[PDB]
Design an enzyme around this catalytic site. Structure first.
Site, mmCIF file in Angstrom:
data_model
loop_
_atom_site.group_PDB
_atom_site.id
_atom_site.type_symbol
_atom_site.label_atom_id
_atom_site.label_comp_id
_atom_site.label_asym_id
_atom_site.label_seq_id
_atom_site.Cartn_x
_atom_site.Cartn_y
_atom_site.Cartn_z
ATOM 1 N N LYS A 1 0.819 -1.207 0.000
ATOM 2 C CA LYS A 1 0.000 0.000 0.000
ATOM 3 C C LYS A 1 0.854 1.259 0.000
ATOM 4 C CE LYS A 1 -3.863 -2.193 0.013
ATOM 5 N NZ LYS A 1 -4.435 -2.361 -1.350
ATOM 6 N N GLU B 1 -10.208 5.164 3.127
ATOM 7 C CA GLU B 1 -10.913 4.037 3.713
ATOM 8 C C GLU B 1 -9.918 2.918 3.968
ATOM 9 O OE1 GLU B 1 -10.707 4.689 0.570
ATOM 10 O OE2 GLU B 1 -10.042 2.786 -0.262
ATOM 11 N N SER C 1 2.192 -9.588 -0.614
ATOM 12 C CA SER C 1 1.740 -8.204 -0.552
ATOM 13 C C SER C 1 1.917 -7.564 0.821
ATOM 14 C CB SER C 1 0.287 -8.128 -1.009
ATOM 15 O OG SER C 1 -0.533 -8.921 -0.172
HETATM 16 C C1 LIG Z 1 -1.469 -6.672 2.703
HETATM 17 C C2 LIG Z 1 -2.612 -6.632 1.736
HETATM 18 N N1 LIG Z 1 -2.569 -7.378 0.624
HETATM 19 C C3 LIG Z 1 -3.564 -7.382 -0.277
HETATM 20 C C4 LIG Z 1 -4.691 -6.596 -0.082
HETATM 21 C C5 LIG Z 1 -5.790 -6.626 -1.103
HETATM 22 O O1 LIG Z 1 -5.825 -5.412 -1.803
HETATM 23 P P1 LIG Z 1 -5.739 -5.497 -3.412
HETATM 24 O O2 LIG Z 1 -6.708 -6.490 -3.929
HETATM 25 O O3 LIG Z 1 -6.037 -4.152 -3.953
HETATM 26 O O4 LIG Z 1 -4.369 -5.878 -3.806
HETATM 27 C C6 LIG Z 1 -4.771 -5.804 1.065
HETATM 28 C C7 LIG Z 1 -5.854 -5.037 1.289
HETATM 29 N N2 LIG Z 1 -5.751 -3.920 1.951
HETATM 30 C C8 LIG Z 1 -6.896 -3.070 2.229
HETATM 31 C C9 LIG Z 1 -8.106 -3.086 1.375
HETATM 32 C C10 LIG Z 1 -7.983 -2.179 0.156
HETATM 33 C C11 LIG Z 1 -8.000 -0.694 0.545
HETATM 34 O O5 LIG Z 1 -7.140 -0.148 1.181
HETATM 35 N N3 LIG Z 1 -9.220 -0.038 0.036
HETATM 36 C C12 LIG Z 1 -9.907 -1.073 -0.640
HETATM 37 C C13 LIG Z 1 -11.118 -0.942 -1.292
HETATM 38 C C14 LIG Z 1 -11.664 -2.069 -1.912
HETATM 39 C C15 LIG Z 1 -10.994 -3.301 -1.877
HETATM 40 C C16 LIG Z 1 -9.771 -3.424 -1.221
HETATM 41 C C17 LIG Z 1 -9.243 -2.300 -0.616
HETATM 42 C C18 LIG Z 1 -7.117 -2.674 3.698
HETATM 43 O O6 LIG Z 1 -7.713 -3.458 4.466
HETATM 44 O O7 LIG Z 1 -6.704 -1.571 4.121
HETATM 45 C C19 LIG Z 1 -3.718 -5.827 1.980
HETATM 46 O O8 LIG Z 1 -3.761 -5.077 3.107
#
Ligand SMILES: Cc1ncc(COP(=O)(O)O)c(/C=N/[C@@H](C[C@@H]2C(=O)Nc3ccccc32)C(=O)O)c1O
Ligand SMILES: Cc1ncc(COP(=O)(O)O)c(/C=N/[C@@H](C[C@@H]2C(=O)Nc3ccccc32)C(=O)O)c1O
Ligand SMILES: O=P(O)(O)OC[C@@H](O)CO
Ligand SMILES: O=P(O)(O)OC[C@@H](O)CO
Ligand code: NA
Ligand code: NA
Lengths: 396, 267, 396, 267
Positions: A86, A108, A376
């Site tokens: 992130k 968020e 990730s």
């Molecule tokens: C370590 C790790 N790996 C993978 C992921 C998966 O995310 P992706 O599918 O995009 O790759 C996360 C997820 N993080 C986020 C969720 C992220 C966000 O911030 N807004 C948002 C809005 C809609 C869907 C998902 C999100 C959190 O809970 O803050 C993660 O923390």
């Protein structure tokens, strides 16, 4: 009118209230300008290298592929400052916010990971940050909440609906629609209205760019496939982007299967949902027959989102990328396996991707394959969740 | 058609339109129908009606809770359309506009949605999360089914947007009072005379101001500024909310409020 | 007889029961052999780079030096796999254990940081790991304990004495004295009997080596001083070592002042103790008039140790390095300041070093000085401790 | 001197030495003195006495708890030396050896420590955490004050260590039964005949075996293997521990145990 194409095939667009279109157009323009600006690129690179710690390692697994013809590397986004990928795109978005003269940040979060990243970038760069988080995620992720507050962010629990990520997203958008003049909405995934899916991809594509260089250096060839979890799509598109034109490289995204697709308690809209319009975009989403948005479920709060970014929907439609699902229990076994056999505690989100890689290996153990899993994030935030599960199952 | 006839009649009488909004089926189907009959009998010139949606991102807590009450009573879009048909049978001339969220329109086919609107006698549709830039399939379907597509003129409108709204919109133009989401507590204070004048120059459909309108003084102020009328939603919904356990007193207070708001529109 | 000098001036030696001298001599020989072995060096480097994530960033502070003529860099050992510098030397020691044919690992821990590092290295490298931890640290650091167990380590609470690090050290040594044939004692700091102070320094000196190259690249000159906390001495000697012969570079070690030196509740033996013999070494220690070992105190469990490594005692005696102390409250203010103004949550150990750097800046704000603080770890493990303090002081 | 005279007398009688160990001041000064008088009266040929230390890293839980009891009674090294002086006044011929931790010897000066040992009539000092490689200032101070420096022959001893211990040690050689820390539950089972023989070849001081000796069969076995005697500590201390609230029965059981252990040394 836009400078960039807002759609990936049928999917994407800018389905927001009219009032927000100026904010979106300004952001697109600032982004296009920034991408041509050497000074912006130099400042972003400086932060990524000297503050966040890029490049991240590419780790060859030593023990978990024993007895098979799979070679498995882990792209170590868990080692980035803040503990997950992130941080990459929040640093770019925070710089864009400053380029536009914005002094405040709305974000968020569900895993609290994007919240932590937004809070740390705002602290560094002098922005006032407020974070929306489902109140169920609040009472479960109190440690991350405190981290955010320590770094000076305001955390606002959201009690409406499922009290998880979708509901945090809703409140963030409601907020940004009466504050866009002074606040930048730092969307945390490659979803939402244009230009966010494009910006987040471009500010995450160093993952795949580094991976490609690293694998060529260590193996002399590209991977047979790269594998990433998909909650909204940022870490996966960041890994995928630089390989899209390398047609021999498989792109595999892993959605949460939760308790099992057949139970309806999952977060796998791309393969088990239906196209709809919400979150500012046209994209697959989990919805009732009447078109009401359904609540998702995953053991992993970062994957608990009933939609998915439009570029993944598009890459799937044309067959460039394949999408699968992994259940809670499969993710938990992968988490335990990485801890015990490589000494890495992974995020429960990332454990979904690892779990699918382990399946590819174990199902066909004499298949020669070179795989990369995007790790990730680190799983420090998840040790209590995992503990309470292992204690409830008599395993500890 | 109904909007054109209303505005011509109001113009003759030197009156603005008062247009209440409620969520269909709040707090139930039968009480909602009685509520709507009361709004009309107390002076409503037109109606704006919402279909309960699971995630109403343009609405504040008052209308969020209206949707939850409707869902608690099991209200579905299909039941909403059966209500709309009955309302049209009772009231042949009043314009009926829907305030929709995009997914409910798109779900089982945009064209099918507007076809059903035509079947039940709806006059206009505003899709809250479809800006003019995304509107092509929506406005085409609307016009194909003799439905007016409504577009929003936000307070940050620029000239190219003014010309688009004036060109593509029919029935009425939704003049936003302020940024943010629906809510009676938040009053729009920014002067809107400039936008009202440009819309008229470009021959836009007559403007109805909405968001934050909760007092008769705000209705007369919008009329005095040139708007053809004013829309009030959260103010109406709070009366429903305040009186859930007193259905009769609810209708009584609704009539009192509507009558006073409509009175202030008689400039 | 030894291959290497066991003393730094008066301090050091090998004050262990006779039974353990063969184990110490074997370890010294294995270490000297390993240091001349290109294959060992290549494997260690590979693990450091591709598994642990070296090199770590050197971060210029953007906001906390505003209004002063101090330039402050942070050496980001917090970004190493595991969250602290401990991982560097455990990887080397684990490789030495394998070079010697040992299959099991004994280690002590207080911050749980060295425990986590030992557990992760053992998991990766196929060793069976048992960790001794003061039972008071157990009941306070249950999250890290679970991390260790997740990675397959046995964690053994120690209830004797102060139930903290000194007592964990005692039990580890008692254990190793009936298990040295099959177990390697992975000592976690640059203390204890020869050859540990020398081995740990050599397996941590990449910290200072990297720092030197990084500062020359960014500033064109060496630092005026480098600053590190001192609990047993590993992170500080790792930062110091490559600068010892750069006589213009100040070396500043920061011991915990706890509630205040005048209270007796501190962990500052180097400046406020008396030379003695314990822990296998002759070194400054906190002791009664009768020569009983006193219990130390710090808010930071990783600094709660009533002795210190002999090379620091020596560097102080000859005036090459200067040692100071920082109290709990000063460390807490530095922790909060880094969180809010740079978006980095530091370990409470490392916050002692930052706190002294902040003092050097604030006391003489027009003094032009280039400083490096070793950010030895991240503060994820400390957020609950800090929360319970801020709640008790009505600050949250 | 006392060790030489003891071993010559035991050799005449074809006997091994039984050497109990206790912590001075456990459970108190006065009961400890009565305990020591009982050990001698029941057949102890020599004494090994520990000075309570805060961190006894060569001791298992039994002797750790002995130290804690002594500390609970406020026992200090200075009080221990006053006990030693009184014990020597009562018993002019019995060899008295101290088992010390290095910091208590080094604290206020190595030479001063051995000078005080000479003043009170101590015969030997074993410093548990000072190997022969670090022993120079300790053994020099000991010999300067007519104190025998005791060295340990561990079961992993090599030949160079054998020659060192045989050369630098006086009084007796401490023959370790096993690795690990003190403790009666852990019995040393490894044969030690080879080490005993080499020590004799190199003219080392006579060997006393210690660690894990808790039964008369182990005493006779050490004597039968060539050792000049055996030391027992934890076994003795557990009797003190078991009988803390029954001081008289404690002395009774101590005498019973010592007499049986000493009987088994009469080969
Ligand atoms: C370590 C790790 N790996 C993978 C992921 C998966 O995310 P992706 O599918 O995009 O790759 C996360 C997820 N993080 C986020 C969720 C992220 C966000 O911030 N807004 C948002 C809005 C809609 C869907 C998902 C999100 C959190 O809970 O803050 C993660 O923390
Ligand atoms: C992040 C961070 N920074 C600085 C330090 C300070 O250590 P140094 O003074 O040596 O630099 C630590 C400390 N960690 C340790 C303690 C460490 C150990 O492992 N054995 C041991 C024995 C004696 C004294 C100290 C130790 C832990 O609690 O596990 C730390 O965790
Ligand atoms: O709720 P308010 O703030 O009156 O806004 C009007 C809206 O509900 C109908 O368009
Ligand atoms: O306690 P044990 O195991 O008998 O060892 C002897 C020791 O206590 C005295 O040298
Ligand atoms: Na999703
Ligand atoms: Na210390």
């Amino acid at each position: 009118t836009t400078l960039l194409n807002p759609y990936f095939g049928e999917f994407g667009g800018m389905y927001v209230p009219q009032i927000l279109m100026p904010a979106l157009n300004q952001l697109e323009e600032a982004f296009v300008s920034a991408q041509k600006d050497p000074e912006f690129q130099a400042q972003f690179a400086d932060l990524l290298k000297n503050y966040a710690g890029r490049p991240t390692a590419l780790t060859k697994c030593q023990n978990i592929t024993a007895g098979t013809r799979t070679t498995l590397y882990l792209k170590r986004e868990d080692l980035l400052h803040g503990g997950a990928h992130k941080t990459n795109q929040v640093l770019g978005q925070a710089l864009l916010a400053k380029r536009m003269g914005k002094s405040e940040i709305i974000a968020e979060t569900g895993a609290g990971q994007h919240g932590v990243a937004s809070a740390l970038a705002s602290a560094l760069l002098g922005l006032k940050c407020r974070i929306y988080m489902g109140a169920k995620d609040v009472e479960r992720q109190s440690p991350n909440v405190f981290r955010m507050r320590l770094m000076g962010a305001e955390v606002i629990p959201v009690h409406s609906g499922s009290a998880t990520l979708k509901d945090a997203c809703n409140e963030a958008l409601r907020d940004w629609s009466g504050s866009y003049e002074t606040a930048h909405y730092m969307l945390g995934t490659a979803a939402g209205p244009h230009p966010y899916p494009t910006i987040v991809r471009e500010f995450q594509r160093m993952i795949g760019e580094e991976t490609k260089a690293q694998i060529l250096d260590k193996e002399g060839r590209l991977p047979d496939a790269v594998i990433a979890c998909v909650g909204g799509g940022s870490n996966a598109i960041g890994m995928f982007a630089d390989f899209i034109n390398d047609t021999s490289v498989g792109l595999i995204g892993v959605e949460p299967g939760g308790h099992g697709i057949e139970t309806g308690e999952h977060g796998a809209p791309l393969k088990h949902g239906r196209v709809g319009i919400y979150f500012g975009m046209k994209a697959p989403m989990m919805q009732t027959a009447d078109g009401q948005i359904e609540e998702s479920y995953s053991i992993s709060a970062g994957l608990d989102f009933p939609s998915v970014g439009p570029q993944h929907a598009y890459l799937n439609s044309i067959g460039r990328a394949d999408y699968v699902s992994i259940t809670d229990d499969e993710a938990l076994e992968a988490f335990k396996t990485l801890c015990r056999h490589e000494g890495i505690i992974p995020a429960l989100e990332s454990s979904h991707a690892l779990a699918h890689a382990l399946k590819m290996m174990r199902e066909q153990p004499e298949k020669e394959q070179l795989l990369v899993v995007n790790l990730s994030g680190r799983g420090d935030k998840d040790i209590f969740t995992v503990h309470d599960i292992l204690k409830a199952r008599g395993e500890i | 058609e109904r909007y054109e006839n209303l505005f011509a009649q109001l113009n003759d009488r030197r009156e603005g339109a008062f247009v209440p909004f409620v969520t269909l089926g709040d707090p139930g189907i039968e009480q909602s129908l009685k509520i709507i009959d009361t709004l009309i009998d107390a002076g409503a010139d037109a109606l704006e009606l919402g279909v309960p949606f699971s995630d109403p991102l343009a609405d504040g807590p008052t209308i969020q809770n209206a949707n939850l009450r409707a869902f608690a009573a099991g209200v579905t879009p299909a039941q909403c359309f059966e209500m709309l048909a009955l309302i049209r049978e009772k009231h042949p001339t009043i314009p009926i506009g829907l305030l929709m969220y995009a997914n409910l329109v798109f779900n089982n086919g945009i064209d099918a949605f507007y076809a059903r609107c035509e079947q039940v006698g709806v006059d206009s549709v505003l899709v809250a999360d479809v800006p003019v830039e995304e509107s092509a399939p929506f406005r085409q379907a609307a016009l194909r089914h003799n439905i007016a597509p409504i577009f929003i003129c936000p307070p940050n409108a620029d000239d190219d947007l003014l010309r688009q709204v004036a060109s593509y919109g029919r029935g009425y133009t939704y003049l936003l009072s302020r940024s943010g989401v629906t809510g009676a507590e938040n009053r729009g204070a920014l002067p809107l005379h400039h936008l009202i004048e440009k819309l008229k120059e470009y021959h836009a459909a007559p403007a109805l101001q909405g968001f934050g309108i909760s007092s008769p003084e705000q209705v007369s102020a919008a009329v005095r500024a040139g708007a053809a009328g004013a829309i009030s939603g959260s103010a109406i919904v709070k009366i429903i909310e305040k009186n859930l356990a007193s259905p009769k007193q609810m209708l009584a207070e609704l009539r009192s409020f509507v009558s006073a708001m409509k009175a202030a529109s008689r400039a």
